[PDB]
Amino acid sequence: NLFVALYDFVASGDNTLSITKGEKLRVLGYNHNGEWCEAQTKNGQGWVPSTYITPV
DSSP states (O other): OEEEESSOBOOOSSSBOOBOTTOEEEEEEEOSSSSEEEEEETTEEEEEEGGGEEEO
């Protein structure tokens, strides 16, 4: 379950996480609708838009 960021996402907060394009993430889960993904990166853990990431 390794993923890569498709775009930069600036953390809006409410447990969201900033990711940079090209960065590697490890996904833990999705929220109720699957629009949001709980991810871990070298900088932390938190929610990111599901559509801003892809497997690698």
